[PDB]
Write a protein that binds this DNA or RNA. Structure first.
Ligand SMILES: Nc1ncnc2c1ncn2[C@@H]1O[C@H](COP(=O)(O)OP(=O)(O)NP(=O)(O)O)[C@@H](O)[C@H]1O
Ligand SMILES: [Mg+2]
Ligand SMILES: [Zn+2]
Lengths: 311, 568, 153
DNA sequence: TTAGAGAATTGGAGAGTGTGTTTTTTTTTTTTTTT
DNA sequence: ACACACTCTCCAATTCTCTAA
């Protein structure tokens, strides 16, 4: 009863969405865009299939690129420390057998992360021979085994969160993300969002960031003061994932206009039909975050604005 | 001995267990009399005794297995159904010995045809996966579903321990992937198949099984686990997985209507917008031509092979998935499994080498360690590829955009290139269709009917039956009048190709034109090819040939070929 | 209905004073009551274990009942009818004998607890009755029971 | 009340008999031919 | 043929019983 009362109280708030974004990864200074992306991945879209029997992917894949000391691995550390179904893996110290499944049959990392978040750190160090295995699994959300007279097929409904280094260690503003990143085009085509982190030296930011860091070393718990408790936030996220929202009429009209705008900006990775499907996924997750059963067009404006920061 | 029980007397089990009650002579005789009285007497609502009609057909096929539905046995004399569920291994012995009496009542001296008959049970009203089985199920009848993972060869086995034998085979059964819960590995069990049931199923099939659940001692299990642990097996009792005149008349009715070709193409791949030429080519490959051979030095395949060069995200993998669900038999990526079917390739040295041999031949041959053997391919190939990196270059010929040898481009019947072109109106049409399809699919009878009929102009169940009917029944031929014009057009195309300095048109293209014309005739169930079939085939092949060329050559070709690509 | 066999009750305990690590299992505690925690790494399929046995003689019509098993498959020592001396050719009556559900699972130490420069140890655990298939690979669990010693059968 | 002559029951000495034994990965360091 | 497990057989050690001094 008290849990229901507390949940109802925070559900009723006008400013719930902003507080939720602000409560992801309390120790990291700034970078609200990545925190918002992490929340929407954690909530996820709505899985569905057509009359033809073809399935439509209901979940969100994210990749983070940055030059050194940008604290990008802290997001992976938070996610694997928070999300109920999750695994952390390093691109250098792992094998295709250990990632998918192996004969001994025993489960790999992607199997344990079924209906969960799978974290890959220093993705750019992974061998091509193993990147293709992740690509094949990500294409189908399915894993296949056939050897030594034993055959098996397994389900892998797992969302991927990845981190990588730009080639040469520092990003080149003269070049496309494809030029900067050691990743093949089919794999790059399958992340819903890309985030690029840069130092952008500025005294007014440095003076504050240094203070924040020194406070963390000076006081252990006291510095962060998050909007919500972790055990409060997990109950909210569990509650939110019960909603299955529906796309409003006006939102359908609005989506094609925003997609036409993206296509005219495109006329940099070339914008395909997949970006519209991804934008729909993000809008589903946004409506779910707000505990609303209708996709208001404002959510699509939010999704479009968020997506264009990746371009 | 002489006296018999009433059916109401069997309501009380009087011994300490079921098996020790069934096996008593007076009880057993009573059960035998009652089962025979059920089998000679059960009826449809129309009278029309079903089991008298099944025994009749048992001899018509010289068969060995009588099939009994469990619901019928539960609808009257219910206690026998209960005993069957509790003690199958006894009950089926009595039931088999009754079934022989009933069959000999139709066919005296049937014992000379087969010495013993087996009753097969059907429609047992409760189901388990391979999760829910426990020790309480031991020696009970069970009904189970899964995928057959592995199959042994067939062997004879000694029946009695003068000699007699029976056939034997073991099958490994695995949980279907849709049933397995998230984050868990699938479970396995092994099934024993005896005399009539061997080779009833093939590896990779999804199968449903009824049988006894049984166990035995095993020394190795006990030794490795260190506990008195028994091993378990399923002994199968039964295993489970055309058209009327009305369908034929309906097919002929729709084929008699004008524009049926266009409607079939329109029905192709409903969820994908645009790309009509790709749908046309796929339909032509699924219908195919007729194979021919002349022992004087030549042979011609009926299969039609198609290759599609795809920009990233231009619907290629979806149409391959659509074809995989549409087609009767197919392989997706092994060519043995594609025999008389369609083979699907969505991305791409030994693999290419195998395809080189496969396109040259129609049958495959191999030798190893002095062994020699042959296999059949006999299949239509649909392939797709990414054009040498991120984007196709239209200023260049096809070879610059692919990683293929020249004879591949020669031996594919149809080649096509699909590109993500820029147009505000096309983008708006695509986006509106996409969001509309997305809403129409949302998890939140009349609704289905409206949805279906808006989706397609033909119900796809009828279209699949129509494709199967056309493939099995229709075998078109050419008409000898217009072939002079075809020869003149062939010569003209060759002359024009040489005149602009193009790579020349060849006999392979002419053969492909005739084969595609046969396929177009087959699509409307016509046993004759016609002039419009040749015109459409000519347009398809000429346009495909033009698309392969460099830009300056392309302009000269289309300026001259206007009387074929657009006119006729 | 015919006669109904007796229910095999199970006593269970919880809220014990303290939880040990896999690394704290030591032979002085054999046969005591304990509680343990770790991450699951493998599980076996459910198998039937023979709990009580009943046999009948081939050379004469005689029956032996309620034979007790422990760690290895065990059979009678004499023919109970003194008119017969055959010790061989017993068969186990599957109807009259009684079985139990049995499952093997395997666990390893919690990663955050491993001491300096060391690596995680593992252990095998037995589950029976209404607790089989409750455990799942990759999950974190807490167990309670008694530690035992198993021979070289 | 002792003791000695005869009968019955049991133990294990030791002799005999049959028996069993030899005997597709997956991960990681290093050399070699191939593009 | 070489250690073992198991079976068979005969012989004398032992205790029990009856009789008379
Ligand atoms: N009418 C359509 N036209 C184009 N794309 C569509 C259409 N409808 C859906 N899509 C989506 O766009 C993609 C269709 O092309 P498809 O080839 O299946 O994608 P892809 O396999 O990821 N690209 P690729 O890996 O190069 O084959 C899928 O992501 C579809 O969900
Ligand atoms: Mg594709
Ligand atoms: Zn006996």
């Amino acid at each position: 009863s008290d849990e229901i009362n507390e949940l109802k109280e925070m559900v009723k708030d006008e400013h719930i969405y902003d507080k939720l974004v602000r409560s992801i990864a309390p120790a990291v200074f700034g970078h609200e865009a990545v925190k918002k992306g992490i929340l929407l991945q954690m909530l996820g879209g709505v899985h569905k299939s057509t009359v033809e029997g073809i399935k439509l992917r209901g979940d969100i894949n994210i990749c983070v690129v940055g030059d050194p000391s940008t604290s990008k691995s802290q997001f992976l550390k938070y996610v694997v420390g928070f999300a109920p179904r999750s695994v952390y893996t390093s691109g250098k110290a792992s094998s295709a057998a250990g990632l998918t499944a192996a004969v001994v049959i025993e489960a790999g990392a992607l199997m344990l992360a079924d209906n969960g978040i799978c974290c890959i750190d220093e993705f750019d160090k992974m061998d091509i021979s193993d990147q293709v295995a992740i690509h094949e699994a990500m294409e189908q959300q399915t894993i296949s085994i056939a050897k030594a007279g034993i055959h098996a097929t397994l389900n892998a409904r797992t969302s991927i969160l990845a981190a990588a280094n730009p080639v040469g260690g520092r990003y080149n503003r003269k070049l496309s993300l494809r030029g900067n990143l050691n990743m093949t085009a089919p794999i790059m085509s399958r992340f819903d969002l890309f985030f690029v982190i840069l130092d952008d030296c500025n005294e007014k930011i440095d003076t504050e960031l240094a203070s924040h860091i020194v406070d963390l070393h000076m006081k252990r718990d006291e510095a962060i003061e998050p909007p919500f408790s972790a055990e409060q936030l997990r109950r909210y996220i569990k509650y939110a994932r019960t909603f299955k929202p529906i796309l409003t009429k006006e939102a359908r009209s609005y989506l094609v206009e925003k997609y036409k705008e993206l296509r005219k900006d495109d006329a940099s990775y070339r914008i395909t039909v997949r970006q519209l499907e991804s934008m729909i996924r993000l809008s589903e997750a946004i409506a779910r975050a707000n505990c609303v059963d209708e996709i208001t067009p404002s959510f699509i404006a939010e999704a479009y604005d968020l997506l264009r920061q990746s371009i | 001995l002489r006296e018999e029980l009433t059916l109401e007397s069997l309501s009380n089990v009087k011994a300490n267990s079921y098996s020790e009650w069934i096996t008593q002579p007076n009880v057993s005789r009573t059960i035998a009399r009652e089962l025979k009285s059920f089998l000679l007497e059960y009826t449809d609502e129309t009278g029309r005794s079903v089991y008298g009609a099944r025994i009749r057909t048992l001899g018509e096929m010289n068969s060995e297995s009588l099939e009994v539905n469990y619901r019928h046995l539960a609808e009257s004399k219910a206690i026998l159904a209960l005993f069957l569920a509790k003690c199958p291994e006894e009950m089926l012995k009595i039931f088999d010995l009754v079934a022989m009496e009933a069959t000999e009542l139709h066919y005296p001296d049937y014992a000379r045809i087969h010495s013993e008959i087996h009753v097969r049970i059907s429609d047992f009203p409760t189901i388990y996966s391979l999760r829910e089985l426990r020790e309480s199920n031991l020696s009970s009848l069970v009904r189970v579903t899964g995928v057959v993972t592995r199959r042994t060869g067939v062997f004879p086995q000694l029946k009695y321990v003068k000699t007699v034998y029976r056939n034997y085979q073991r099958v490994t059964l695995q949980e279907a992937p849709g049933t397995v819960p998230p984050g868990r590995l699938p479970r396995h069990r092994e099934v024993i198949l005896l005399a009539d049931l061997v080779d009833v199923s093939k590896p990779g099939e999804e199968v449903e099984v009824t049988g006894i659940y049984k166990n035995n001692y095993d020394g190795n299990l006990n030794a490795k686990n260190g506990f008195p642990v028994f091993a378990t097996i399923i002994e199968a009792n039964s295993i489970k997985r055309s058209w009327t005149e009305e369908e034929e008349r309906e097919f002929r009715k729709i084929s008699r209507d004008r524009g049926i070709i266009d409607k079939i193409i329109s029905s192709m791949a409903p969820s994908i917008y645009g790309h009509r030429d790709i749908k046309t080519a796929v339909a032509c490959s699924l219908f195919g031509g007729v194979p021919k051979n002349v022992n004087g030095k030549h042979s011609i395949r009926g299969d039609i092979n198609v290759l599609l060069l795809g920009d990233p995200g231009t619907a290629k993998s979806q149409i391959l998935k659509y074809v995989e669900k549409t087609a009767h038999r197919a392989v997706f990526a092994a060519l043995v499994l594609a025999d008389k079917g369609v083979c699907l390739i969505d991305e791409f040295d030994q693999d290419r080498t195998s395809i080189h041999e496969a396109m040259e031949q129609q049958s495959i041959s191999i030798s190893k360690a002095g062994i020699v053997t042959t296999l059949q391919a006999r299949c239509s190939i649909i392939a797709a590829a990414n054009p040498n990196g991120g984007r196709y270059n239209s200023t260049l010929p096809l070879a610059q955009n692919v990683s293929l040898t020249e004879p591949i481009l020669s031996r594919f019947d149809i080649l096509c290139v699909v590109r993500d072109l820029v147009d505000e109106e096309a983008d708006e049409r695509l986006a509106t269709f996409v969001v509309d399809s997305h809403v129409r699919s949302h998890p939140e009878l009349q609704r289905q009917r409206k949805k279906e009929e808006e989706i397609s102009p033909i119900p796809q169940e009828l279209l699949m039956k129509y494709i199967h009917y056309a493939r099995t029944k229709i075998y078109p031929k050419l008409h000898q009048m217009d072939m002079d014009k075809v020869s003149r057009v062939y010569a003209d195309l060759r002359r024009e190709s040489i005149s602009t300095g193009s790579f020349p048109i060849t006999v392979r293209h002419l053969e492909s034109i005739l084969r595609i014309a046969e396929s177009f005739a087959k699509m409307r169930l016509s046993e004759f090819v016609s002039s419009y079939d040749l015109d459409r085939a000519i347009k398809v092949v000429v346009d495909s040939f033009v698309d392969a060329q460099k830009v300056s050559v392309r302009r000269q070709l289309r300026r001259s070929f206007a009387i074929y690509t657009l006119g006729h | 209905s015919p006669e109904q066999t007796e229910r095999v009750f199970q006593i269970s305990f919880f809220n014990l004073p303290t939880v040990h690590r896999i690394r704290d299992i030591r032979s002085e505690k054999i046969g005591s009551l304990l509680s343990i925690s770790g991450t699951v790494t493998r599980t076996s399929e459910v198998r039937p274990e023979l709990y009580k046995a009943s046999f009948t003689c081939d050379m004469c019509r005689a029956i032996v009942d309620n034979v007790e098993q422990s760690f290895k498959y065990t059979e009678p020592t004499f023919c109970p009818n003194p008119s017969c001396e055959n010790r061989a050719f017993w068969t186990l009556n599957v109807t009259r004998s009684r079985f139990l559900d049995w499952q093997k699972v395997r666990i390893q130490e919690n990663a955050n607890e491993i001491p300096t420069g060391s690596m995680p140890r593992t252990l095998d655990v037995i589950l029976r009755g209404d607790s089989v298939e409750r455990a799942k690979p990759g999950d974190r669990c807490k167990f309670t029971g008694v530690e035992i010693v198993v021979p070289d059968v």
